[model samples]
Target: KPCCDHCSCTKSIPPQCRCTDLRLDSCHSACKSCICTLSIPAQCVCDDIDDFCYEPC
Candidate 1:
């Protein structure tokens, strides 16, 4: 794995990539049902702190 590369997530922050504790299954399901754009980072999160998370703009 690269410094900040988590295949599960399109793009992740250094901390999140370092932690490597994120899942997007629920988000994916939601997207499938909702049929809308959820966006990466926003789709899934393991850390509570907003600073370390990566959200799509």
Candidate 2:
């Protein structure tokens, strides 16, 4: 369940940021918690954005 289910990309948290929901215990999950950053400048980010699927119930 997402705010925009038709969009190719969306914003979400880890393991739920992607649109591809994983079938874990009949539960739906997408995306994953990631650490996107680099050194020198010293930057850390939680980039786990993803697309969504419209699976009819």
Candidate 3:
């Protein structure tokens, strides 16, 4: 899971960047990845192999 989440709006109207936990499985606790939409708040889940989540500063 993403220990930290990152989101770049490229400067949106409201600058949406509300991050939350997303899971590939049904378990919520197991979710640590992020899902920052192109211009909105979101969660996260691992897309690639089990690389453990990477939060880009």
Candidate 4:
């Protein structure tokens, strides 16, 4: 299944970030580690980060 289940964008990464319980699995494009939080919006989006998902959860 694809990531960002609630997003409508079809790009590899979502246009915005959303909080969830999911985490990146060990894969070619997956991030080894990411720190996502629902308390802060700016720290949630991965577009500026190196993670594969545009948002981490």
Candidate 5:
């Protein structure tokens, strides 16, 4: 199986890239549909594009 590159994923999947995680005593990532919550202290996550991930900034 051949893998894709950059924002694109393997097997014709969605973008498989890494987003920066914002940590400011409380924060989240900056990707589309990446975060969804209402809890204080904040929480960041990545969905949909399953292979996508995040990194500390």
Candidate 6:
């Protein structure tokens, strides 16, 4: 079966991604949603954080 590039598996957030505080204004265009929160390494960062996924695939 085909999988979503942004979110793989049946789960919403991919196993490699998670929510975070980092905010990237540019991501808003590519992201569905976003929020303000603290940065979490390996989980998330503030510089180029996006609502779509944490780290780049």
TM-score of each: 0.18, 0.18, 0.20, 0.18, 0.30, 0.21
User: What does the lDDT read for residue 26 in candidate 5?
Assistant: 32
lDDT of 3 by residue, 5-49 (tens): 543332545444422335333223334343334433343343332
Best by lDDT: 5
Which of the two candidates, 1 or 5, achieves a greater lDDT against the reference? 5
Let me know the TM-score candidate 5 reaches against the reference structure: 0.30
- Candidate 4, residue 21: how far the Cα is off, in Å: 18
**Which stretches of model 3 miss by more than 4 angstroms?**
1-5, 18-57
Candidate 4: deviation at residue 48, Å?
12
lDDT of each: 0.31, 0.35, 0.37, 0.35, 0.41, 0.35
Query: Which run of 10 residues does model 2 get worst, by summed lDDT?
Result: 22-31
Q: Which 10-residue window of candidate 5 scores lowest in summed lDDT?
A: 1-10
Model 6 TM-score relative to the real fold: 0.21
lDDT of 6 by residue, 1-57 (tens): 111224322345543443334333323334445343344322322333323443443
How does model 6 fare in lDDT?
0.35
**Model 2 lDDT, residue 19, Cα:** 35
| Candidate 4 local lDDT, 1-57, one digit each (tens) | 234433334345534333233334322233334455545232432232332334422
Clashes of 2: 3
Each prediction's RMSD to truth:
11.5, 12.5, 11.9, 9.0, 8.9, 9.8
Give the per-residue lDDT of model 5 (tens digit) for 1-57: 112222334554564554343322332423445563566665644333546543323
**Between candidates 3 and 6, which one is better according to TM-score?**
6
Q: Which stretches of candidate 1 lie over 4 Å from their true place?
A: 1-19, 27-42, 49-57
Q: So what's the TM-score on candidate 1?
A: 0.18
In candidate 6 the C-alpha lDDT for residue 55 amounts to 41
Comparing 1 and 5 on TM-score, the stronger one: 5
Ranked candidates (lDDT, high to low): 5, 3, 4, 6, 2, 1
